[PDB]
């Protein structure tokens, strides 16, 4: 399938080169998979989700997304125009308040929830979690993300945005999951993106257009924006049978475009996520 005049990040992750404008992908488009956007929520009524997005859990008086961050991240996963995995089932878990803040306890519980909730949802091709959030180093947050990952949920986390090594951030610094840095439309590392050995992969992160609350769209930048490409790719590749949860970060590493990026400091993988589609 071909979606013309696509958001640059979708076209990039189906391309071997920069500056192209058509997103290429297999029409199965992640059908039968499930992604948990663990974030501020999802405006599940947005026309762009087509009834494929539900709110499953909140730790606040409301489950509505009153900030916008989660709706954007969810759209890159699977909105009809701005998403990588245009047929995936989107489940929202609101752990962050409408100001974008959340206590670590809340964040651990929410990962625990998804570890159990997946056994109540039909996701026969696989389950993916996207964590576009992070804070300072926490062994417990890291342990909680390990525990998800181990419960057979491919877990994709944001590297963070301080332009520093990701070893001093969580859950970014957990070796067992998939830590995602950001790159721009000219194949540079984003200047704000963290870096280091714990990164697994870079996906598109600068000036990312996606769904926003009120049935609106907008562009924003971050690893928080990079992480949803890879989860949706993780969810897309699992539906094609190519890979499992236990192993999708490694598979996405092996088949990623190599050496394309500049602005990468020594000790960090030069690997930009690629979907490997040949029509």
């Amino acid at each position: 399938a071909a979606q013309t005049n696509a958001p640059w990040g979708l076209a990039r992750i189906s391309s071997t080169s920069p500056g192209t404008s058509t997103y290429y992908y297999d029409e199965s488009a992640g059908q039968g998979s499930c992604v948990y956007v663990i974030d501020t929520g999802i405006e599940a009524s947005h026309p762009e989700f087509e009834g494929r997005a539900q709110m499953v859990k909140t730790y606040y008086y409301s489950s509505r997304d009153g900030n916008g961050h989660g709706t954007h991240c969810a759209g890159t996963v699977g909105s009809r125009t701005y998403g990588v995995a245009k047929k995936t089932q989107l489940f929202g878990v609101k752990v962050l308040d409408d100001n974008g803040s959340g206590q670590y306890s809340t964040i651990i519980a929410g990962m625990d929830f998804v570890a159990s909730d997946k056994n109540n949802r039909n996701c026969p091709k696989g389950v993916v979690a996207s964590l576009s959030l992070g804070g300072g180093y926490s062994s417990s947050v890291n342990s909680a993300a390990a525990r998800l990952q181990s419960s057979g949920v491919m877990v994709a986390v944001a590297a963070g945005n301080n332009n520093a090594d990701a070893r001093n951030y969580s859950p970014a610094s957990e070796p067992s999951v998939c830590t995602v840095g950001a790159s721009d439309r000219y194949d540079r590392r984003s200047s704000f993106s963290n870096y280091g050995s714990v990164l697994d992969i870079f996906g598109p992160g600068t000036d990312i257009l996606s769904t926003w609350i009120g049935g609106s769209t907008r562009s924003i930048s971050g690893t928080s924006m990079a992480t949803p490409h890879v989860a949706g790719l993780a969810a897309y590749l699992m539906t094609l049978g190519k890979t499992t949860a236990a192993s999708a970060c490694r598979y996405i590493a092996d088949t990623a475009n190599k050496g394309d990026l500049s602005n990468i400091p020594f000790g960090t993988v030069n690997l930009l996520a690629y979907n490997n589609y040949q029509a």
């Binding site: 962050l96 803040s101 959340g102 670590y104």
Partner: peptide, 6 residues
Amino acid sequence: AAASVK
């Protein structure tokens, strides 16, 4: 501690 949107 408090975590935050990235």
